[PDB]
Coordinates of C-alpha atoms in Angstrom, one line a residue:
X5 CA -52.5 -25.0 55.9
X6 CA -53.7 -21.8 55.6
X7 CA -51.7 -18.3 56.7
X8 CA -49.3 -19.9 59.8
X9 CA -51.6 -17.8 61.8
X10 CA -53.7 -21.4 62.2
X11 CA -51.4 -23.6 60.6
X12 CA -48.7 -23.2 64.0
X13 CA -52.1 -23.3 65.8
X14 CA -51.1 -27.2 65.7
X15 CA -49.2 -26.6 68.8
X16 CA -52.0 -25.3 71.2
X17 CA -55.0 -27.7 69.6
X18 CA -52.1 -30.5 69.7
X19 CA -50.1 -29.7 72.9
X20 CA -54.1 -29.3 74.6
X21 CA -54.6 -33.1 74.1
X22 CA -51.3 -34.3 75.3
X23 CA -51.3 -32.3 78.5
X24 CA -54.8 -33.5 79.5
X25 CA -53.8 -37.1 78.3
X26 CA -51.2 -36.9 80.3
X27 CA -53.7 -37.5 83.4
X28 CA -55.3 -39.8 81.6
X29 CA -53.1 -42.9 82.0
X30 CA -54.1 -42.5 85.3
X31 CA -57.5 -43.9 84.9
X32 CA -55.9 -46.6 82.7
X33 CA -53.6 -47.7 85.2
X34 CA -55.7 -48.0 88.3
X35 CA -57.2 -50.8 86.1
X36 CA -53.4 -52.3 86.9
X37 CA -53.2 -51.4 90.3
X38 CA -56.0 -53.1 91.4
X39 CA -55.5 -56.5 88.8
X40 CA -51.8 -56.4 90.4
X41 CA -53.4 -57.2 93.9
X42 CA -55.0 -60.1 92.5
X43 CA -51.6 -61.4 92.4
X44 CA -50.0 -60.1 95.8
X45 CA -53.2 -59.7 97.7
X46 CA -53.8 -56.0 98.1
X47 CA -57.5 -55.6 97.6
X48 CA -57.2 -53.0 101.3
X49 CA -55.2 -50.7 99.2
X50 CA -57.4 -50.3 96.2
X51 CA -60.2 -48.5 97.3
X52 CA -58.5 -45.9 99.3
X53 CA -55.5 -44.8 96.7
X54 CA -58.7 -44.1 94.2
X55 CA -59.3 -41.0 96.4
X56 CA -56.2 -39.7 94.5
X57 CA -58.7 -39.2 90.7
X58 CA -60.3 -37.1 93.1
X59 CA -58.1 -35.4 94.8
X60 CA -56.0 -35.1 91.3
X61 CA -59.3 -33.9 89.5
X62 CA -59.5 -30.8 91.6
X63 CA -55.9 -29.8 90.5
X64 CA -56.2 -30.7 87.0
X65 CA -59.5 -27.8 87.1
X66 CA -56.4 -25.3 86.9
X67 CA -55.0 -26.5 83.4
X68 CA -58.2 -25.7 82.3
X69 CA -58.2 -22.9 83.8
X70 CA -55.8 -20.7 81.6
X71 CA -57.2 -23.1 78.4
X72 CA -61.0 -21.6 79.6
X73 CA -59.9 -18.0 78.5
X74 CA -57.7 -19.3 75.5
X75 CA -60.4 -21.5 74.2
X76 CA -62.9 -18.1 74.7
X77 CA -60.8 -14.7 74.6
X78 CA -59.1 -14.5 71.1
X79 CA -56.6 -13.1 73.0
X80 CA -54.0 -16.2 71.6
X81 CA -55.2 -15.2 68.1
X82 CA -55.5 -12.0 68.5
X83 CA -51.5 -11.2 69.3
X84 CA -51.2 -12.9 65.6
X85 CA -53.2 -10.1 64.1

């Protein structure tokens, strides 16, 4: 609540969870994909399309990537000043 110097800071610290999260469902709905099969029989195609957490966790590394030097170089901050 302080000067809007932190107070906007909401954004970053709010919009950091939200674009990570949105990867997260990911995890969350492989637990579908695989209880779906159950229904239509597709226990082949479970194991295989879990490859993509993997292959997705690897691209994900460059959203952190620009969030590595924000988090660390008060370079965000320091345009405020």
């Amino acid at each position: 609540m302080k000067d809007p110097k932190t107070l906007l800071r909401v954004s970053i610290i709010g919009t950091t969870l939200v674009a990570l999260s949105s990867f997260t469902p990911v995890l969350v709905i492989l637990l579908g994909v695989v209880g779906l099969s159950a229904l239509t029989g597709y226990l082949d195609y479970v194991l295989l399309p879990a490859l993509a957490i993997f292959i997705g966790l690897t691209i994900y590394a460059i959203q952190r990537k620009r969030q590595a030097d924000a988090s660390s170089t008060p370079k965000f901050n320091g345009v405020k000043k």
